[PDB]
Amino acid sequence: SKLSGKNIGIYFGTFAPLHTGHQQQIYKCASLNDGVLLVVSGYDNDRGAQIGLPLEKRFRYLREAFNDEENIKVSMLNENDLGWDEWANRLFELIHHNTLENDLSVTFYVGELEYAAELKKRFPADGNQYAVEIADRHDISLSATQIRENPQEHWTHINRVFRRHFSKVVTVMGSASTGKTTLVRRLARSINAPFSEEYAREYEEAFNIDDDELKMDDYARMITGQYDANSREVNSPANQGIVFLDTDAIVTRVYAKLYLPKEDFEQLEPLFRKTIADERMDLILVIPPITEYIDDGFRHMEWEESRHEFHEELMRQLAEFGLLDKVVILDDEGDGYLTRYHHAIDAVHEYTGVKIERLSY
Ligand SMILES: NC(=O)c1ccc[n+]([C@@H]2O[C@H](COP(=O)(O)O)[C@@H](O)[C@H]2O)c1
Ligand SMILES: [Mg+2]
Ligand SMILES: [Mg+2]
């Protein structure tokens, strides 16, 4: 799993994120050399680490993004503890370890004049021919900066592996037979967005059990099962920058506190914590209890009638996890906004920046 050929090229980047600018250059470099070593640099709290893409995560995403290439290897250049001399020691250590042959024609592709200048001073006498080539990376670096500043605006250019991280997430929460499913569908269809289904609905249909028949192990199953489903939408190739999620672990954790014995709830507690902590939410739409009884079709037999009891615990728990600043309650139909959906789609506009057409003048 090392790089073959004589003419090999070295390409640098912080890749925060990798985008079609880098890629278009990287593939050009691959057509001119027998092989290419991508070198990701980073240090704690760097520009990428401050948006949640530390060097390690960026390196793994790169390996995944180029898992397909016979002649492209991804390598890590750890710039912690730096003083150019030791930096170059590591860089040529990378080259030596990740190459197969001797008598190489190595071409560095560098974008800053300081780097090329300090690199030319330090070619070691190891049988290789070294050249440093300058590249105008202004447009690539500006693009990566624009992407971090507003990912939704430059979404199509973000490499798909990195899109996993930059997605806005809207989660709809509320007791059943309150309209969530109609709401999630219409919100997501408004902006050509993907959406998830309430997993408890699908679990209860596939396993043919009612709300009162759920035991602890069923809740356990619904936690990881709803998360997988939401994670599947977050990472969908249909995602354009915003996804909508029909409930999450908090919802399930509200039902579980309300209906499980204390001991059985105490036992799901670690899985609840781990799952809820892994949930990135940007906007939380809460549908409050109302005397409506929507019933899109399927009836949660028991998760009705005590809607206020559910809504109080739900708000209790949303506070417990410090999420209230992301929360918007759709308290309409007797409050203002025209409909529950008008309020919601406008909140989607406030929190994600997407344009929404008005119906009237
Ligand atoms: N289920 C959810 O609400 C939710 C929200 C955000 C991310 N995720 C998942 O967790 C991961 C987040 O990765 P980062 O650590 O890069 O943010 C993603 O791969 C995604 O699939 C899940
Ligand atoms: Mg991924
Ligand atoms: Mg508690």
> Would you call 280 helix, strand, or coil by DSSP?
coil
Nearest to 133 by CA among 6, 28, 5, 17: 28
From 51, 159, 164, 271, give the residue whose CB has the most ligand 1 atoms within 8 Å, as the site to mutate: 164
In the β-sheet with 283-286, what is the strand arrangement from edge to edge? 242-246, 168-173, 283-286, 327-329
CA–CA gap between residue 39 and residue 62 (Å, rounded): 10
Q: Is the CB of 224 under 6 A from ligand 1?
A: no
Specify if 354 maps to a domain.
no
Question: Which of the listed residues 166, 187, 214 is the one where a domain comes to its end?
Answer: 166
Specify if 311 maps to a domain.
yes
- Residues 191, 132: one domain? no
If one counts the domains in the chain, the total is: 2
Nearest to 11 by CA among 58, 73, 101: 73
- Residues 151, 230: one domain? no
Q: Is the CB of 279 under 6 A from ligand 1?
A: yes
CA–CA gap between residue 274 and residue 281 (Å, rounded): 15
Q: Determine contact, residues 326/281, Cβ cutoff 8 Å.
A: yes
Q: Determine contact, residues 339/333, Cβ cutoff 8 Å.
A: yes
> 2 exposed, middle or buried (CB, 10 Å; 0-12, 13-18, 19+)?
exposed
Q: Is the CB of 306 under 6 A from ligand 1?
A: no
> Would you call 92 helix, strand, or coil by DSSP?
helix
The residue range of the domain holding 138 is 1-166
Pairing of strands 327-329, 242-246: unpaired
The ligand with the least distance to the CA atom of 165 is 1
Q: How far is CA 197 from CA 33, 76, 245, 247, 329, in A?
A: 48, 39, 7, 8, 20
- Residues 294, 326: one domain? yes
Could you identify the residue written with the tokens 């912690």?
80
- Residues 77, 201: one domain? no
- Residues 155, 270: one domain? no
Nearest to 1 by CA among 58, 60, 72, 107: 72
Atom 6 of ligand 1 has which residue's CA nearest to it? 280
CA-based R_g, the chain, Å: 26
